[PDB]
Structure formats: C-alpha cells, structure tokens
Amino acid sequence: SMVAGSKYRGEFEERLKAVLDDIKNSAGQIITFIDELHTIVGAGAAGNMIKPMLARGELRLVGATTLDEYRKHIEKDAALERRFQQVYVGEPSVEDTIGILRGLKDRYEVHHGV
Amino acid sequence: QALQKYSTDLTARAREGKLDPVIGRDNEIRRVVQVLSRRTKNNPVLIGEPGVGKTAIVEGLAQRIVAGDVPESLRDKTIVALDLGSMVRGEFEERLKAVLDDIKNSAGQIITFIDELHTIVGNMIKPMLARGELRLVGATTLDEYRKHIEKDAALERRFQQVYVGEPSVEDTIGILRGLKDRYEVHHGVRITDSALVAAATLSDRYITARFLPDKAIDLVDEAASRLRMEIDKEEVGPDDIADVVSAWTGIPAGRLLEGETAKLLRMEDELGKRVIGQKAAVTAVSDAVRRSRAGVSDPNRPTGAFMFLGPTGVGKTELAKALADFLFDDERAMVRIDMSEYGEKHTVARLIGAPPGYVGYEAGGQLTEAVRRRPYTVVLFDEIEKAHPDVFDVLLQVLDEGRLTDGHGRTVDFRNTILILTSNLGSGGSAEQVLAAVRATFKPEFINRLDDVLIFEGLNPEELVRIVDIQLAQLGKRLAQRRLQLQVSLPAKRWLAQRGFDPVYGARPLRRLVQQAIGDQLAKMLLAGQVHDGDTVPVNVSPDADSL
Amino acid sequence: QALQKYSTDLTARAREGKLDPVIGRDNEIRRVVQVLSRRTKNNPVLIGEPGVGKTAIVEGLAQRIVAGDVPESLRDKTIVALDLGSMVAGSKYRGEFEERLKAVLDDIKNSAGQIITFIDELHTIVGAGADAGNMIKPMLARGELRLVGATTLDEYRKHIEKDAALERRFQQVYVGEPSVEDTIGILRGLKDRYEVHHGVRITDSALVAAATLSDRYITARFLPDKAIDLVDEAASRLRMEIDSRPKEEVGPDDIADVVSAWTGIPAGRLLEGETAKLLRMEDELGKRVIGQKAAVTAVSDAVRRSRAGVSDPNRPTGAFMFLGPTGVGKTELAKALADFLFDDERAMVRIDMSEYGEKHTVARLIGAPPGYVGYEAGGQLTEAVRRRPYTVVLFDEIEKAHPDVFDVLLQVLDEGRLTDGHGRTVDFRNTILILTSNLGSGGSAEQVLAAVRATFKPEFINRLDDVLIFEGLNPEELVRIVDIQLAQLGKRLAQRRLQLQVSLPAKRWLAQRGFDPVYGARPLRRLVQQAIGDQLAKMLLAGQVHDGDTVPVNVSPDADSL
Numbered sequence A: 001s002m003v004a005g006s007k008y009r010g011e012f013e014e015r016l017k018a019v020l021d022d023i024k025n026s027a028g029q030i031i032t033f034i035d036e037l038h039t040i041v042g043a044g045a046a047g048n049m050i051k052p053m054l055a056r057g058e059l060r061l062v063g064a065t066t067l068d069e070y071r072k073h074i075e076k077d078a079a080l081e082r083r084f085q086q087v088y089v090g091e092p093s094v095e096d097t098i099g100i101l102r103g104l105k106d107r108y109e110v111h112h113g114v
Numbered sequence B: 001q002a003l004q005k006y007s008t009d010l011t012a013r014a015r016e017g018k019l020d021p022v023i024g025r026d027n028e029i030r031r032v033v034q035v036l037s038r039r040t041k042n043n044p045v046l047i048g049e050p051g052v053g054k055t056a057i058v059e060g061l062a063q064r065i066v067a068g069d070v071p072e073s074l075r076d077k078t079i080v081a082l083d084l085g086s087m088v089r090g091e092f093e094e095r096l097k098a099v100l101d102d103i104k105n106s107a108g109q110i111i112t113f114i115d116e117l118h119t120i121v122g123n124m125i126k127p128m129l130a131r132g133e134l135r136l137v138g139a140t141t142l143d144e145y146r147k148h149i150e151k152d153a154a155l156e157r158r159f160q161q162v163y164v165g166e167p168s169v170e171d172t173i174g175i176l177r178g179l180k181d182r183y184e185v186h187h188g189v190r191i192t193d194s195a196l197v198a199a200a201t202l203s204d205r206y207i208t209a210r211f212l213p214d215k216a217i218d219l220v221d222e223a224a225s226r227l228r229m230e231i232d233k234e235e236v237g238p239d240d241i242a243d244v245v246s247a248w249t250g251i252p253a254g255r256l257l258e259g260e261t262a263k264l265l266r267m268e269d270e271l272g273k274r275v276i277g278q279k280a281a282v283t284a285v286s287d288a289v290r291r292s293r294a295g296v297s298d299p300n301r302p303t304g305a306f307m308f309l310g311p312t313g314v315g316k317t318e319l320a321k322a323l324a325d326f327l328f329d330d331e332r333a334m335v336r337i338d339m340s341e342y343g344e345k346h347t348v349a350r351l352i353g354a355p356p357g358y359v360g361y362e363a364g365g366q367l368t369e370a371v372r373r374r375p376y377t378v379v380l381f382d383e384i385e386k387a388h389p390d391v392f393d394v395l396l397q398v399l400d401e402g403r404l405t406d407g408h409g410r411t412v413d414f415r416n417t418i419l420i421l422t423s424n425l426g427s428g429g430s431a432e433q434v435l436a437a438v439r440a441t442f443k444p445e446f447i448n449r450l451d452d453v454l455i456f457e458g459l460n461p462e463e464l465v466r467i468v469d470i471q472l473a474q475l476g477k478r479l480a481q482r483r484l485q486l487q488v489s490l491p492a493k494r495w496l497a498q499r500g501f502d503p504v505y506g507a508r509p510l511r512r513l514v515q516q517a518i519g520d521q522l523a524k525m526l527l528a529g530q531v532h533d534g535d536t537v538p539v540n541v542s543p544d545a546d547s548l
Numbered sequence C: 001q002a003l004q005k006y007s008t009d010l011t012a013r014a015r016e017g018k019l020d021p022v023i024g025r026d027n028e029i030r031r032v033v034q035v036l037s038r039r040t041k042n043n044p045v046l047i048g049e050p051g052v053g054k055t056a057i058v059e060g061l062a063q064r065i066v067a068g069d070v071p072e073s074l075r076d077k078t079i080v081a082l083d084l085g086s087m088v089a090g091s092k093y094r095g096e097f098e099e100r101l102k103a104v105l106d107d108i109k110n111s112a113g114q115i116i117t118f119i120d121e122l123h124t125i126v127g128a129g130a131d132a133g134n135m136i137k138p139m140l141a142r143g144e145l146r147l148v149g150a151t152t153l154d155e156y157r158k159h160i161e162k163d164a165a166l167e168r169r170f171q172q173v174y175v176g177e178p179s180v181e182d183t184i185g186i187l188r189g190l191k192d193r194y195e196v197h198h199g200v201r202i203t204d205s206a207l208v209a210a211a212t213l214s215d216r217y218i219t220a221r222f223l224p225d226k227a228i229d230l231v232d233e234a235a236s237r238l239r240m241e242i243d244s245r246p247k248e249e250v251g252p253d254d255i256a257d258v259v260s261a262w263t264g265i266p267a268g269r270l271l272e273g274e275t276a277k278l279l280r281m282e283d284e285l286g287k288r289v290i291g292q293k294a295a296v297t298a299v300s301d302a303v304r305r306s307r308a309g310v311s312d313p314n315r316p317t318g319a320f321m322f323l324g325p326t327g328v329g330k331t332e333l334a335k336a337l338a339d340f341l342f343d344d345e346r347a348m349v350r351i352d353m354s355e356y357g358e359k360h361t362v363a364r365l366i367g368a369p370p371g372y373v374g375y376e377a378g379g380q381l382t383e384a385v386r387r388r389p390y391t392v393v394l395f396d397e398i399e400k401a402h403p404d405v406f407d408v409l410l411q412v413l414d415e416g417r418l419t420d421g422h423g424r425t426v427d428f429r430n431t432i433l434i435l436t437s438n439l440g441s442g443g444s445a446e447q448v449l450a451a452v453r454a455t456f457k458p459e460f461i462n463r464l465d466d467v468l469i470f471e472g473l474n475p476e477e478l479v480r481i482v483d484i485q486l487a488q489l490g491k492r493l494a495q496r497r498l499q500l501q502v503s504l505p506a507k508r509w510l511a512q513r514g515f516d517p518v519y520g521a522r523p524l525r526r527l528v529q530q531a532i533g534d535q536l537a538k539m540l541l542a543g544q545v546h547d548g549d550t551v552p553v554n555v556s557p558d559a560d561s562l
C-alpha cells in the first residue's frame, strides 16, 4: 500500500523518506518488521534508500524469509549482508507437534461446534 | 577512495589486530613472495582442499608485510580480498566492469585475492591482466582446477600453482596451542593442555569429511561452547571432547581409547554373538588374525589367507560377515565371488579385466574392481574346488605379494584384506577323508602357502533353538506397529528346528519357514478379527502344524 | 567515442617505451605488411603453436610504425586492440551487443583508413549470438578494417574452420618456432629488462646454457618462451637468496639447477659430491648384490658415461639384457640400481611379461585407437613415462610373451620413441631399459647364445647393448646374502627395541638349507620366515619374551630353535 498510488515522479521516494523519518523520530520504541524482506530488492520502479538508515541502527527490522530465497535476492548484494544476522529455524518433531496440537485443540472446537 | 564502499580490506585490518596468529607454514609464504616478485607468470594460485589454510597463508603474508620482512619491491603495498558473494546475470558482469575499472584507476599496490576463482574463470580479465597493472593471488581446489582453469581458461599459461597440503598432528597441535588465548573473550573456562592433543589425534582418526586445521575447531571450540549452558566444572578435557565426538560420529563412546588391545582381545564370544557354536574355528581364526598385528612378518602379504570347508548351512558365510563387521566396522564389506564358471581358460581373465578396447573393459575385472575401492574387505571364494587350474596361479602371486595389475594397468593393494576359500567337498567323513580329498584335488604347494585349513562341523539340536530364537526376534522387531508379542513354546521351537534342518543345505529354509506360517497366518488373523493391539498371541503345536 | 571505451592503443603505447624489443623475424613482418597493404581482403592471421611469438610480431610492427620504417601507405596508422569480451559483458536484452558493436564499426569506417585493427585470440569472434561475429563479413571482404589477428593452430580449426564463409576472408601467416641460435639471439637482445627488474647480473654463458638445456629436457613446450622461464626463475631465486636472508650473478649452473629441480632430471655439469658417489658406485652397489662382478661394471659404466657427458644424446641411456640361471639376482640387481639412483623403491616402472601370452594384450601399454572403449585413458607405459621421465624400466622375464610384443619395443630401443592412441610421442631418451630372461638355463656361454639367436631375430639383438650372462652362485659367499637377509629382518624389527644374536653354526645351517642348486637362492626368504618369524611372533604374543630381549638362536640339530 506504499506503492499503491504513486506516479508523480517522486511520490514513492518522498513517501518512503517520510515514513522512515517517522520510524527514526521515536528511538527504540518501535521495532519494525518486514515480512519477506526479499521483495525490497527492487520495488522502486526501496532497498537502497533504507541501507543508510540501517547504518544507524535506529530501526530494529526483524525479518523472515525462506532459506533458499535468502541467497537469491538478499545475498546478491554484499552491502546488505553486512547488517543482517541469520537465525536458523528448525522444523518441530513429533512430540513437539503433539504438544502444539494439544495446545491448539480448543479453537477449532468453538469454530466447528464439536 | 572508490572501492571501500563495496569491498573489504586485509592490510588496514592488519594494523588493528583483528587477524589471528600466523604460526607455522613459513615455506609457502616465501614461495608465494618469490613467485609474485617475478616478471612473467607473476601471480600464484594456491591449490589445496578446503579448510587447509589458504586465507591463513595470505593474511599471514599481510601480517608480515605490516611489520616489514618482504623486500622493498613489494614493501609499502596493500592487499584486498574479493567479496565473491557480491556478484553471484547483468550484475556478475557490470559490477565486474566497475571493480576492474576501479583497479585500473588505482594503478598500483592494490594486490588482490580472489577466493574460489574457478567460478569466475572468464576472458575479460585477460586483456587487462596481460598488460600487467594488477596481480591475482588465487585460491581454489585441485579438482576444480583440472575442470575449469585447464579448458575454460585460455589463460592457464600465466598462472603458477603453489601447492598447500594439510599439516600433521604435531603442527596441528602447535596451531591449537597457539590459538588458546583468544578463547578467553568468547568463552571463559580453564582449557586444559591435554584436551588439545586429544582433540587433534581424535579428529584425525575418525572424522573424514573435513581436513586438519579447521577440523580441530568444530572440536573444543564446541566443547567450550556447549559448556556454557551450565551458568543459567571449569576444566575441559578428553572426556569433554569424546562426549561430542561420539555423538557426532554416531558410534557409542566405548572405543574412545585402547584401539590396540581392546577390539583385539575383545575378539571373543561377541563373535559368538553373531555365530552360534564353532568356538574352535572362532578361536583359531582370532589367533591367526591377531598374530598378524604384531609386526614381525613381511608387510607384503594378506592380513589372513586361511580357508575352511565342510558342510553347508552351518555358518561359513555368517562367520565371514561377523568377522567383516567386527574388524572393519561394516557388514556390507564382503566381495562374494563364485568360482563355478571359471572352468575354462577363455573365462579366466574375466576377474582381472580385458585390454583397452575389447568387450569387457569398462566393467573392469570382477576381482580387482571391488578392491580398488575400499581396500579393507574380505573376499570369499565360493566353490573353489572346481575352478579351472589357472586361477590358482593368480591367487598364488596374490597371497605371495600384496600386488596385482588389472587390465587398465592400475596396481591394487591386497596386503590388508582377508581371503577365504570356501569349499564343500567331503563333509561326510569325520576328519580324514576330507583331508585326503583336499590333498588329492589341490596342489600341495598352495596349501603350504595357505594358513589354517580348519574344518567345520554340524550343529547341536540344543543350540539350534538359539538360531530359531534369533529369527523369532528378527520377526518380532517387525510386528511392533500393532504392538504384538509372541508367547512361543519349546515344542514349537523344536518343531521349527526339525523342519528347518534338511542336512544337504543347513539352516537355509528358516528365513522362509518361520516367515510363512507365523507372518501370513497372523496377518490373516489381524485382517479378519480375533486379535487386536497389545495381545499376547500364544503359539503352540497342532498335531502336524503349529496353530496360534 | 566508442572505440576508446572498448579499445586500447598499441601505437600510443609504443611511444612510451612500454613494449619489448622484438628481435628478428623479418619475413613475418614483411608478409604481414604486404598483406595489410593490398586493395581488397587485407586481413592477415598469425597462426602458430602456443608461445612461439605471435603477439610479439604485432608489437614489433607497432614499434616499426612508431619509428617510421614502413612503406608509404602505412604512416601513422595507430593500430588498435579491441577486446570483444568487454562488449558482451553487460547485455541481457534484445539487441544490445548489436548496437554496442555497430557503434564501433561506424566509428571505424567514419574515419579514413588509418584504424588498423587487432583482435587477439579471434577464435572468440564466433559467439554472442543468442547473428553475432557475423556483421563484419560485409566490411571484411572490402578492405574497410584491417584486423590483424592471432590464434593457436589448434583453436583455429576448431572454432573458425567450421565457418568456411568467414575463414575465406583471412590470409594465414604461418609462424614456426625458432631454432636454438635464434633463441640465443633473442635472449641476448632481451638480457637488459631482467637485469634491471632484479638487481643482479646475467651472463651470456647462462643464456646459452638455458637455450641449449631447455631444448633437450623440457620436451613438451616451444622455444622462444620455454627458455625465458629458466632465466626469470633463476634470477628470482638468486635475488631472494642474496637479499633479506641471514657469485653475485646468475651463471650456467643455476639454470641447470632449475632444470634439475623442476622436472626431476640430473642434468647439469656434475657438481661436487656426486662425483664421489659415482667413483664409489660399483663398490656401493655391490653391497646389496653379491657376485656378478662382470655385470655390475657395465651397468655402472653406463650411468658414469651418461652423467660424464659422453653418450649419444638421442638414444636410451642403456638397453641391457642379462639372463642366466634361476634365482641369481637379475631383478634384485635391477631393484638395487633403482634404489641407488632414486633413493626410492617404487620409482622404477616394472611390468611383467607373463600376462602377455596373447597377441591382443599389447593394447595395455600402447592405448586404443580413436573410437574404441578405452581411448581417453591412454597407455599404461606411455602415461607412466610421460611423468617421471627418469625411471628405469624392467621387462621382467621377457620369454613368455610370444614373438609379437618384441616388435613394439623394437623401436623403443635404439630411438627412444613410443606413440599412443592420441598420436603423441614420448621419449625414452634418458631412462635405463632392462629386460631379464631365463632362456638357456643350464648351458654354457655357447649353448644359451644359440637359444637367444633362435628365439630372437637379428634385427632385435642388434639394437641392445652388452648381453650379460649371469654366473652361478659360488659356495663361499653364500653366508653374506644370509647376513643381508638377517639385516633386513633386523631393520624390520625396529618399531621395537628387539635385537638378535644369530650364531655362526646357525648361519651355516641357514645358508646350507634353502639353497637348492636348481633354484638358486629362491627358498631362502621363505625358509628364514618359517624358521624365525613364526617362532618370534609366538614367543612375543605368548608372553615370556618382551622388547629389548636380544635373544639368540641355536642349531637344535633337526630344526632351528631359539
């Protein structure tokens, strides 16, 4: 919805500048979170006007992407990886899945009345 | 002032101290220096496996440069590594144009270092490299050299190959004891000095995927790492290393030490755990194989060349499988060749190979091809007694020198294998008629070169039930998906033992008989009804069959 | 403005002196000029083996143009060196390289005819298609661009000659490699850039030594270049020695040192220390082989003559065949020589002759012709001698191979030549050939010679040197080979501190036993094993004998006991 309507030759640039400066106003409070942060590689005509802001550490920018996709869009440019810290996530096992399902089998009962 | 925005540095980062020590391997540095201080071919490439220390070598050259040991010809220089992840189209090439033009406009001491150049090699660097305004310290793998830089290059004629080999355990321990102070800022413990040598000599033996200098870092750097969870006992040791090495290799922590007396005197009823009875043969073979681990005989001979014969279906092959998986840690380490078709001279060469250009050549010889790979196998010779009298000439120089040449021209090493000449002649007489038949059918010179010629014997009905119980346990492992057991009766066991003897084949029909009745009958049971999960399923003997 | 971000300028690079003094090769420059100064289709191509001076010709032409030494219609032509790789780098679209090349072609043809072109390695001109390297075929056969080229004789007919409409517009200028005297002249001309790149001095004697040596021993490269590597490497090594490390010039000994260290050959001029060992060579070799004094002398004189500088330089260093009774020491002498010459036992290339009873089995040491099963592999012997061209070759027991295998090495002997499937020749010019036999086996010096003359043909005996007859084993010195075997067993018993105290009557009995007069000293090894090693392993595994036990032996009349 940031690039939804923007066609007057500077609109998306100034819009992203404004929202980023809004992020930088309140320091520490707001933890940004972009899902599928590989999409910001292009999306301009972002990605390059967020790097200098990230060189200040003010924004937190927790993210999430798939492993194979990380080394296709993000790991094309090395100036991005210098400010990224990968935390691998493993899939749960059978016992953990049984526990999770035991914890979740109360919402489907109120959804479907059985 | 144009590339720092996009690349790293190993010269300015050397004045800071972020580099680790450079201890050891001082010949390769001088070789690289004298190769780079040339007029032609003045750019070396380091050729070695991964994790051997190429980056260590180049950063050590940089660390020597920063203090000043090189001649003035390459003094007051600076070196930079190339970040290959920055390129990998349209970017692998445009960024390459940009960086090469940056180096051109640097015009001097910007000596580079490309890691894994076998991925970059392709020709746009040749018109700039032949002009001589940049140097290229390379690093890659030998096998990727013969593939890319020998064909895809067209520039191989201006690359020197500086060879880097993995260090030994002694200088590995040296590097380890050199890099122990920096392990007080990331982890804080009192690292012991015996831990380092233990980790080195242990990683060397069993770990195979990695190589020495870096392989000793997935060690104790792991032991000092996984001793951190106990702050939410400050001395690491050989136990705190073995506990992770065993969990790594999946082998239980029993063989952590004593690989010369344990697993050698332990050659006992643990063999009998696999083969039931035949204690005389077990002891004879164990003594013969442990005699060869002394070091008094000539090193060019098989580890054990004994044979044995008698009746079939008693455990001849089973003793072989047990010896194989005990002595070589693998059950599928046998080469069972069948000497029943080698009854002609035009079929003798089928096990050695054929010359380069005739029918069976790429298939290789039937004997040597299985030994070129995994030279730690036992080689069974089924039905040797009826082989044509020309394979004996081959196995003569086999058990005379641990050498043999296949059709390709290669030379195979036999001096650490175990030969077995299974035969079935006789089997009726107690001890003497089989010896007479041996002396009549075999060349008495060959048997003199052979080791013990021990004989097998029949099986006792009391211990025969143990094998039936082994098969019943094998089956019981399978019907656990329904959580069933078997309440087995002694008349049933003895009935199975009598109906699976057939003294012309031995214990061959057990795998079929025990399977058929029990499995299929109880499967029909579970399918129809009258049995559910957790049942006991008692089994007894009907007048003829064994009802459940 | 296009042919300046995609092109260098060789002419303007020659004015700065940033080129090399091309020496000689006048016919090639003359033909390049007279082909470059015609009316239509004036495109020359410099063909030749790799490293024979193809680019140096163009550099010399550039220097000649700068100096004003060309015909009248070649003044101030500013030859330009394109790089077609920097135009196909960034282009992932429809019609990008087409524009990038059309701009250059238009800027060439816009000026007058003084933009003489130079595309090095023009076998890369057929790519970038998808109609590429094909837009210039109109301007080629019209004398619009000159296009001086250069490519390898092998890469020519692999990439270009499949485009017979494109190779019609090129005139092939063949460039062959020079001779030794021409290389000496080139080096004399070039012995000024290295003397200033390194702070050392170089001698004409060293230059001549390099030019002469690199032609005889480095037999897989060509010779304007294989001789400058030696000079450069020797200068670099001597500089690294002279400076920064705790006769100030390179001479004719450092070049030989480089040629010896690299490619592993004792070529040189017999420095000190080797001569001592070569004088004390027969007496030393006689320590591992006892007797045969009439056959050690010939083998030793062969190597002494070879490394003394007096031998036919294009022929093997020795082709001895020695035969005689069984178990006398033929292969043992062969192995002793291989050990004394290389300090290693596996260095020799031993092939048997019991597996070659059949005619078709010769393809193992030759190879296979094109279009057959094993063809990229090659031949066993050829590959084994391509690398390590200094070993000795043992043709063990060459009597069983039937008379068709002899004809193969009939020209290995007397020339040192052998070809494989790929048609490449390998030279056995500095390897000692040795082939044993057992023909005769009982006769005198006139009965076994008849057997040789009957089993071989006159064109085969004529190739090889002295036919040595090994003499029998003299009942006296038999104790010494027993001492040899005992010392070998003792050296084997080194991982422990074990010693031995073998008695004189025990030695006498061990020598008398296992010495069958028809089988020489064959059973002695097995006899020593049976009578020592089994009992020692028993007494070492059953306790009661630990390490350091210098235990003796006795006669024990029937069988040798502890």
Ligand SMILES: Nc1ncnc2c1ncn2[C@@H]1O[C@H](COP(=O)(O)OP(=O)(O)OP(O)(O)=S)[C@@H](O)[C@H]1O
Binding pocket: B157, C020, C021, C022, C023, C024, C025, C049, C050, C051, C052, C053, C054, C055, C056, C152, C186, C190, C224, C225, C228
């Ligand atoms: N006539 C000559 N005068 C002086 N130096 C020469 C002469 N011919 C060759 N050289 C030198 O010998 C070496 C041979 O290099 P080049 O001939 O340039 O390689 P090349 O001929 O391009 O072969 P390739 O296959 O392209 S590497 C260079 O150092 C040349 O300077």
Ligand SMILES: Nc1ncnc2c1ncn2[C@@H]1O[C@H](COP(=O)(O)OP(=O)(O)OP(O)(O)=S)[C@@H](O)[C@H]1O
Binding pocket: C288, C289, C290, C291, C292, C325, C326, C327, C328, C329, C330, C331, C332, C333, C438, C481, C484, C520, C521, C522, C525
């Ligand atoms: N003069 C000798 N000096 C030392 N060892 C000798 C001598 N003659 C024979 N031997 C030993 O005899 C054994 C076999 O010698 P070989 O050279 O293999 O026999 P051979 O000369 O090849 O004869 P054949 O016909 O080929 S079996 C080795 O253990 C040698 O050490």
Ligand SMILES: Nc1ncnc2c1ncn2[C@@H]1O[C@H](COP(=O)(O)OP(=O)(O)O)[C@@H](O)[C@H]1O
Binding pocket: B020, B021, B022, B023, B024, B025, B049, B050, B051, B052, B053, B054, B055, B056, B175, B213, B214
């Ligand atoms: N002589 C040495 N001195 C200090 N560290 C060494 C030495 N040899 C090896 N190492 C260590 O071993 C590791 C090997 O890693 P590296 O050389 O990057 O792998 P690669 O062989 O793929 O370049 C390095 O982290 C280095 O610290």
Ligand SMILES: Nc1ncnc2c1ncn2[C@@H]1O[C@H](COP(=O)(O)OP(=O)(O)O)[C@@H](O)[C@H]1O
Binding pocket: B274, B275, B276, B277, B311, B312, B313, B314, B315, B316, B317, B318, B467, B506, B507, B508, B510
């Ligand atoms: N002593 C024994 N210990 C364990 N299993 C045995 C024994 N004797 C026979 N068997 C079983 O009986 C079968 C006999 O088959 P096999 O070993 O091929 O016979 P042979 O060795 O005579 O060729 C094997 O599957 C084996 O599991």
